[PDB]
Amino acid sequence: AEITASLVKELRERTGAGMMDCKKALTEANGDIELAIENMRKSGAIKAAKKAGNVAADGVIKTKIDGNYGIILEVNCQTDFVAKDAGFQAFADKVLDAAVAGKITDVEVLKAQFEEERVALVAKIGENINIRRVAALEGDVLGSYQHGARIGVLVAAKGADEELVKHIAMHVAASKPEFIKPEDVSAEVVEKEYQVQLDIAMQSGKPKEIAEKMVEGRMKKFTGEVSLTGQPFVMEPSKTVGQLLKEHNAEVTGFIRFEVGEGIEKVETDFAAEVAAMSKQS
């Protein structure tokens, strides 16, 4: 069947695929738009496989609380333009809902469940999209905080109202503690850190006596700085979150903080030199 511009347009209208991709698919299907759609469906994976090589450091972090159950999710893409895109947003939200509905905390299953959709989405957008990680937090009182689509955090507490839990979530988003209380830092970590701070003092030419005495002091702070209760409340640095909690007879039982692209080495592109490399041809 002759592939008219309108035929290609019709295929594209219902597939969201590229002008020429639609054209070529019809060439194979010989005008049968139905076969074309199926073929293109099979092609999506190859197109997605090609893009899988591209670094996806952008994206969004999403949080969702349903009772005493909450999920935090990271879905990546290449540019924030797509992170803003309705198609991407819809996919991310759908993954979130499923994650909460089915209590899914294992990314492998979640990835598996959305593989076909992801592939179809990537084929249209032309950017690597990837469900990176997902986690849940349970507690008496659950609160969340989104710092744009960039940072997301879940906070579980006891004897704390919504406003308190929101403030602690904001603090976690800003201060990145990795423990709840100082006493949660293993004696092992403390010892390792002691040695490190010791080697640094020593090389400084400091007398062993003075050096150790100093490090001994600096260590007493260490646990506080890496811990939620030991960190100064961002909204009022004159008190620690620990005091804030005591003033409210509250206790934090858990928290999780995700930030888009953590662990991914985003490259610092130099346009000027990139163009220069292209200017080789003449």
Binding site: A5, M19, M20, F81, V82, A174, V234, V275, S282
Partner: protein
């Protein structure tokens, strides 16, 4: 020679860097020959940047490093618009890029003009949806690779684009052409003749005899230019760029202060409230170490002085961290001569912790 700032907006795989290379190579051999690139036509000089990120572009545009006069939407005809093309155009709308020219790339691979027709229809419709003259928008059907391959048939298309940059985008208005305005710095009197306000003429010309208006901080006033003097040389007029000292007529010293502005009567009005696009410096950029909240009351540095202000953060926003872009509705403690597009800095105890741009005057 006119200076136009342009930029490329498009899909990662649609050939923006390639086209930009084709632009330099072709313009060079034909006429004589955030990081950016530069090239010239026989009429203008161009500073070309790339818009790979929305927030990224916004940040540069706010920090004074962008201000596009026209944008090139690079859409490869092999695919046509991508879903994110809406976001590419939407950014253009949000920052208010005045003109958009389209470059259909990879046209050499579209085995049918009818298909090139379809792609165009889509582009023009998307542009219109965001209030751009879709049907008046110059759309060049080119190919960056072939042009770069010296294929004179395609190089022609590159120059066609350069032609549109020259025609579609009009010559940016010159400061000398803009009405006279001078940001007041120091105000001193000679006695022998009159009061003198020092400053660099921001725009236009001030000639002896001309009347002017003192805008900002206090109720606007009018006065007459009883002499224009520059450093170690008296002249008859202060022009754009020239750091001068304007002598006025019968206006007492305690009536003119730093922060106020001299301007052609009627050309600029004072305001207290405005909506602004703001960027907060990260710690590494020398800004705040911690985030601020709703009660933040910094100073807004307009041209030559700080004016304290109250901040209205967006609904649902209660924490601004170093490195954030954010919209804020500000209420200054007293008026300051301002127009939309007016840049300002945010300072704490005298140190700059952020930069901003007046998006919409309110009061």
């Amino acid at each position: 020679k006119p200076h136009v700032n342009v930029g490329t907006i498009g899909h990662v795989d649609h050939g923006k860097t390639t086209l930009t290379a084709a632009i330099t190579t072709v313009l060079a051999k034909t006429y004589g020959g955030t990081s950016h690139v530069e090239y010239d036509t026989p009429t203008r000089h161009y500073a070309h940047v790339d818009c790979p990120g929305h927030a990224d572009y916004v940040k540069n545009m706010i920090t004074g490093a962008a201000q596009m006069d026209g944008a090139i939407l690079v859409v490869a005809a092999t695919d046509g618009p991508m879903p994110q093309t809406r976001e590419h155009i939407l950014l253009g709308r949000q920052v208010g890029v005045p003109y958009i020219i389209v470059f259909l790339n990879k046209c050499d691979m579209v085995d049918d003009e009818e298909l090139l027709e379809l792609v165009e229809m889509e582009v023009r419709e998307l542009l219109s949806q965001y209030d751009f003259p879709g049907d008046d928008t110059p759309i060049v059907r080119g190919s960056a690779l072939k042009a770069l391959e010296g294929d004179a048939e395609w190089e022609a298309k590159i120059l066609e684009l350069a032609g549109f940059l020259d025609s579609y985008i009009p010559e940016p208005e010159r400061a000398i052409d803009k009405p006279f305005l001078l940001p007041i710095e120091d105000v001193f009197s000679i006695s022998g003749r009159g009061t003198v306000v020092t400053g660099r003429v921001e725009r236009g010309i001030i000639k002896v005899g001309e009347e002017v208006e003192i805008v900002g901080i206090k109720e606007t006033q009018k006065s007459t230019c009883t002499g224009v003097e520059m450093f170690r040389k008296l002249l008859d007029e202060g022009r754009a760029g020239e750091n001068v000292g304007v002598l006025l007529r019968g206006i007492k010293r305690e009536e003119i202060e730093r922060g106020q502005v001299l301007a052609k009567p009627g050309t600029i009005k004072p305001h207290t409230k405005f909506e602004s696009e703001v960027y907060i410096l990260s710690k590494d950029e020398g800004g705040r170490h911690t985030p601020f909240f709703k009660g933040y009351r910094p100073q807004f540095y307009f041209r030559t002085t700080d004016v304290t202000g109250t901040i209205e953060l967006p609904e649902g926003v209660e924490m601004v961290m170093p490195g954030d872009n954010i919209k804020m509705v500000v209420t200054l403690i007293h008026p300051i001569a301002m127009d939309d597009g007016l840049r300002f800095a945010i300072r704490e105890g005298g140190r700059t912790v952020g930069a901003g741009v007046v998006a919409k005057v309110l009061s």
